[PDB]
Amino acid sequence: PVNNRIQDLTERSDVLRGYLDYDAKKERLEEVNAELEQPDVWNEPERAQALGKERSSLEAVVDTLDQMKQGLEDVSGLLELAVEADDEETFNEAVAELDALEEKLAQLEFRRMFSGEYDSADCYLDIQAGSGGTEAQDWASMLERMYLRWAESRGFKTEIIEESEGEVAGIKSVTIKISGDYAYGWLRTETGVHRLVRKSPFDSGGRRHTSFSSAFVYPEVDDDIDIEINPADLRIDVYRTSGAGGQHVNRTESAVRITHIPTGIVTQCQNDRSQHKNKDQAMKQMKAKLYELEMQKKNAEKQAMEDNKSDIGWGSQIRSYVLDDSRIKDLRTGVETRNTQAVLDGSLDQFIEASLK
Amino acid sequence: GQKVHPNGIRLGIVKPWNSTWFANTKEFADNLDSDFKVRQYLTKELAKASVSRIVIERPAKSIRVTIHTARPGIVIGKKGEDVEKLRKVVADIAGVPAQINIAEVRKPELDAKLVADSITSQLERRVMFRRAMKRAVQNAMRLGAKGIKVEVSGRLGGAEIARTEWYREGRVPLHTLRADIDYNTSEAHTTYGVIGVKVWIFKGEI
RNA sequence: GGAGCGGUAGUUCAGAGAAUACCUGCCUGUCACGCAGGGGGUCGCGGGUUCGAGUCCCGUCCGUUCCGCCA
RNA sequence: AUAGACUGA
RNA sequence: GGCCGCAAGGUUAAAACUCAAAUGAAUUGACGGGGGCCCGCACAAGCGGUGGAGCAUGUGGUUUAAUUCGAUGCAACGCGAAGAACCUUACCUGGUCUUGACAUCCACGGAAGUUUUCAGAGAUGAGAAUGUGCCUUCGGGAACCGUGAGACAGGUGCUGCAUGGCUGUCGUCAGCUCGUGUUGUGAAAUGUUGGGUUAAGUCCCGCAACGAGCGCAACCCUUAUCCUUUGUUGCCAGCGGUCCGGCCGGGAACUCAAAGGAGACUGCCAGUGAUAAACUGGAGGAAGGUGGGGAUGACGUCAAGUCAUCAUGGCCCUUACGACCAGGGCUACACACGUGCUACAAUGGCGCAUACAAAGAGAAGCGACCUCGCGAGAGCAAGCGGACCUCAUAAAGUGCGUCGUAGUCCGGAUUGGAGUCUGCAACUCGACUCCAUGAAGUCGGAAUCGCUAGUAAUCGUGGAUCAGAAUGCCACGGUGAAUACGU
RNA sequence: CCCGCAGAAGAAGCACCGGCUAACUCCGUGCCAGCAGCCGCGGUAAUACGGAGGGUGCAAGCGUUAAUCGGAAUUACUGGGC
Ligand SMILES: [Mg+2]
Ligand SMILES: [Mg+2]
Ligand SMILES: [Mg+2]
Ligand SMILES: [Mg+2]
Ligand SMILES: [Mg+2]
Ligand SMILES: [Mg+2]
Ligand SMILES: [Mg+2]
Ligand SMILES: [Mg+2]
Ligand SMILES: [Mg+2]
Ligand SMILES: [Mg+2]
Ligand SMILES: [Mg+2]
Ligand SMILES: [Mg+2]
Ligand SMILES: [Mg+2]
Ligand SMILES: [Mg+2]
Ligand SMILES: [Mg+2]
Ligand SMILES: [Mg+2]
Ligand SMILES: [Mg+2]
Ligand SMILES: [Mg+2]
Ligand SMILES: [Mg+2]
Ligand SMILES: [Mg+2]
Ligand SMILES: [Mg+2]
Ligand SMILES: [Mg+2]
Ligand SMILES: [Mg+2]
Ligand SMILES: [Mg+2]
Ligand SMILES: [Mg+2]
Ligand SMILES: [Mg+2]
Ligand SMILES: [Mg+2]
Ligand SMILES: [Mg+2]
Ligand SMILES: [Mg+2]
Ligand SMILES: [Mg+2]
Ligand SMILES: [Mg+2]
Ligand SMILES: [Mg+2]
């Protein structure tokens, strides 16, 4: 079976060679070496050092795959000298070398799935029923159950944040926190509307009906603003209290106005008779406004990603689940699985792997 | 709903058995299996011989097979060569000496098995189901049957939805136990599926 | 800034309870309603008195009020 | 005397 | 916009845009918290249960490497499964094979086979001996094993919303139709409606209808009475004798056994009724109005169930979605539901004594008698392919004694120890026996089920599956009620 | 316009085939791509989508769009209704 393991790693190396196109990376390296070999590259140090690091990045994949095939040949040769000569010592040594090759190959395998700052952040799944009514709610409940079971299989923690139970059956909307290593990276590609094609149990006539449920996965964010304002970035000016005392002959410089020098936001307080209390109130208001600015920065996605969220209805399907004919298919990846049962409870990684492309 | 088999419900009243032999519990199963093998062989070879039914009788250490057919000439063969060859194989299957006799089923139109086989053959040859059913009913009534009911079920005409059609003329009393109701079934393997044909023939009471 | 009122079941209110809420089992073709059986907080947070504290006392967050004026 | 509602192939 | 009006508003009066319909009369169904008339344990009157406890079993859920697949209101849930330790097995882990485990066919080598070692958990692999046979144009081969093809095998893989076949259900409900004639432009109507009457579209009468078919009834099985046969392995009235035991001699009476007939037909009498159909009674008769029970399930309804009995179009895999083997799983367990068994005791527990059944199975089987073991059973060994022998003491019941209202001399769950039987092998995961322990449970909330007479309730007995493994399924008898004013 | 020379030699495409309306099968797709004057077709066995074979109707033209009349007795004078 160890020879089968060698072939399996050979298959993994060969497909990883195709995916990462190390020959094309070497093709990129062809013109990388053109300017690096000649001394006429330090005129612009950005051209020199960046190419040097890019060359290392290209050769990282290229050389590892080269060492991968060479190592596989060495393991095959050692096992031929081991099993045929009954040398169990070399038989175990080649297994350890083969395991080391798998570790090197897995590094490049994980390299492709490495993407985004939130790649290791905990993911938050939101499932909302759409067209289909009660049947859509049931489909949403079936959708969240397999997501929870998939997360449990991966070992990720499950936390039901909120669920608004359906009026008749199922749940209208669920929000579940899935916490684990690279949880967002695993489930970031499960975003969209899923189509369910089955005979509706709620329909009296038993007609074949189509239902839709959404699945929005938003990553873990700081969700907190701890920005502290700077006295050097703030300008405070005192002036007469125009309100409630601006009429009298005797006016004091109790009114204050704090203007943020970088941003330009102006804040003024005239309620209290003491300039120090007015300064404190203006400081609270200005800091609160700055807090709002960072919140609006976070809210930029709440107006963009929410708009990008396609309607839960016809024509927005990302994956088709034909339970009547047992032909679950992901249109985006072109992957068809005949076993509906498995996809209904777990085994979603089969479509996830192709979705990582 | 569901209907009892006319032959089974009339087995002891107005119908004979297709297998008449006495055996204890030890050899009852062996005799039944041997009869099944003999019938399977004879039906396969004499499919083109228009065999209505086969009766297997087991005397002491012997098996006498009577084959009822509408075309005795082909079954008998030249100088009895065909029946002799059939007798040899039947004896080999049974394990005891065999004696094959041939009976003539005159008026082939008044036989449930023959009509059902003819209809299925026409359906396989893509003959219109209604034309086949009407012709079979008309022939039986012309010959002198007091009543005939023909039912054809399946994907008739290649339609994606199967349906059941039936034509009945005369009296076909299925609730009278003293009625000589001849009932038989057959199946036609068309290019779209399997089509079942059932024939009821009433030839009088008692 | 001064003087009071509070903070208790998921929520609203009493002093560890009530209503709503939530489970489970019934009824019904199914839901709702309805019937029956249950659980659910250890008193905003800390300290101190007390044999003994949700309670009494002090400090602190938290919300509610009124006042904060005359030149 | 009380008694409501059955999405969408 | 104009005119009118105190106002509310009235009068005249568009356009953009949108859809392929909107609408009237009539027809067939379906429905109504519309009407009239009826039926069914449907209510009403009763009896006994479930829902509370323990256990058995199935299901959902959860868990798991797998916990195989299917069945989901009535009409899924002691269901396919009339019986998972291996097998079954279709699932998982691991070790293996790849014209294959299973088929045809070509060529070549071989008889086929029968025994012994051999390494492996086993598959398998390496050997070693033994025979090397039979029909035989003695020319052949025939059969049965291997090798090498490659056309092909193989699938419990998907679709029951492509199908055949089979089945459930409304529902054994009484309805569903057709030919011709007639009416209406037509969908359609009539017949098939109406007065009775019936279990019934059962029958009579009327009628633009006349007839017919599938349905109802009858013909079929069984039971209740009698006659005729036949009298053994069954029976014992008259006897003969007898150990008193139908035990022999006997007998063909009777019970009984299985074949053929008789009998029940509103056939007869009274009364009502439209001089009809029928109904209410009565006589006789074993049986009176279908005497009881069963089989028999119309056109169709649910795209109802089954592609996993089987067959089957199409699609899918072919060094694997095929095949072999070992082990494990289907028996997992924070829970919920369904169907049952045992109880919560005195109409009873226990000890002793003593009566009354029916039906069925048995040859790789039923197993007598005797001996041994407290017991499950063990040894020996008759009879029976059976009205003969065995399974095979029926229990409830009756008599006596005791317990004396207590979680008990109720209840027997659970657990410890020791054994028997089948089976290669009872760890996961069989049944049973002996000693020991002795749980909940003291009659069960909302709610819910079955039953109209030899029925309910209760008591035992047998069979299919099956080497072993029933509280389930199927059948057999023993005691044996209460109630039905009525719609 | 006529007479000679040479050689079949230099010369056929467009729309459509579910019904209206003449002309049918296979393959690919799977409520997607798309078609569409109206009814509508496509959700794994499509004569309606795309391609191929065959066929139909026109032809140096063939289809689509725009505009008028007709069908429209659907402004009814011929010739309608409350
Ligand atoms: Mg509403
Ligand atoms: Mg106006
Ligand atoms: Mg009642
Ligand atoms: Mg219970
Ligand atoms: Mg199951
Ligand atoms: Mg299946
Ligand atoms: Mg097993
Ligand atoms: Mg096994
Ligand atoms: Mg079906
Ligand atoms: Mg007419
Ligand atoms: Mg009628
Ligand atoms: Mg009728
Ligand atoms: Mg009438
Ligand atoms: Mg009739
Ligand atoms: Mg009449
Ligand atoms: Mg009488
Ligand atoms: Mg009948
Ligand atoms: Mg179905
Ligand atoms: Mg199904
Ligand atoms: Mg099971
Ligand atoms: Mg067990
Ligand atoms: Mg017997
Ligand atoms: Mg006891
Ligand atoms: Mg107790
Ligand atoms: Mg009754
Ligand atoms: Mg038995
Ligand atoms: Mg058994
Ligand atoms: Mg009984
Ligand atoms: Mg045409
Ligand atoms: Mg196609
Ligand atoms: Mg005009
Ligand atoms: Mg008009």
Can you give the residue ranges of every domain in chain B?
A: 16-106, 107-206
| Three-class DSSP category at A173 | strand
Bases of strand D lying below 7 A from some protein CB = 6-9
Q: Where are the beta strands (DSSP E) in chain A?
A: 123-128, 157-165, 171-179, 192-199, 208-219, 234-239, 255-260, 266-269, 317-322, 328-330, 335-337
CA–centroid distance, A222 to ligand 31, in Å, is: 78
Which structure tokens are listed for B115?
């009509």
Strands A208-219 and A192-199: antiparallel
Alpha-carbon gap, residue B203 to B111, rounded angstroms = 10
Q: What is the DSSP string of A267-297?
A: EEE-SSSSHHHHHHHHHHHHHHHHHHHHHHH
Alpha-carbon gap, residue A80 to A90, rounded angstroms = 9
Q: Contact, A96 vs A20, CB < 8 A? A: no
Alpha-carbon gap, residue B206 to B178, rounded angstroms = 5
| E211 C1' to B111 CA distance, Å | 30
Cβ of residue A203 lies below 7 Å from strand C:
no
- Chain A residues 190 to 209 whose Cβ lies within 7 Å of strand D are 197, 200, 202-204, 207-209
Q: Contact, B50 vs B69, CB < 8 A? A: yes
Q: Contact, B187 vs B152, CB < 8 A? A: no
Cβ of residue B193 lies below 7 Å from strand F:
yes
Method: cryo-EM
- The separation between CA B135 and the C-alpha centre of its own chain, rounded to angstroms, equals 19
Q: Contact, B67 vs B102, CB < 8 A? A: yes
Which structure tokens are listed for A218?
């938003």
Cβ of residue A165 lies below 7 Å from strand C:
yes
| F2 C1' to A268 CA distance, Å | 113
- The H or E element containing residue B66 is strand B63-69
* Nucleotide nearest the Cα atom of A198 (by C1'): D9
Residue B81 sits at φ, ψ, to 5 deg, of -65, -40
| E301 C1' to A15 CA distance, Å | 59
Bases of strand E lying below 7 A from some protein CB = 62-63, 69, 94-96, 158-171, 212-220, 295-303, 311-313, 316, 321, 362-364, 385
Q: Which residues contact B177 (CB under 8 A, 6 or more apart)?
A: B9, B10, B13, B14
Alpha-carbon gap, residue B107 to B42, rounded angstroms = 22
Q: Among candidates A218, A202, A154, which has minimal Cα distance to A181?
A: A154
Residue B100 sits at φ, ψ, to 5 deg, of -95, 125
Cβ of residue A209 lies below 7 Å from strand F:
no
Residue A29: how many other CB atoms lie within 10 Å: 20
Name residue B78's amino acid: K
Which residue intervals of B46-170 are DSSP H helices? 72-76, 81-94, 112-124, 129-143
Strands B63-69 and B163-170: unpaired
| E113 C1' to A43 CA distance, Å | 94
Q: Among candidates B150, B148, B19, B166, which has minimal Cα distance to B94?
A: B19
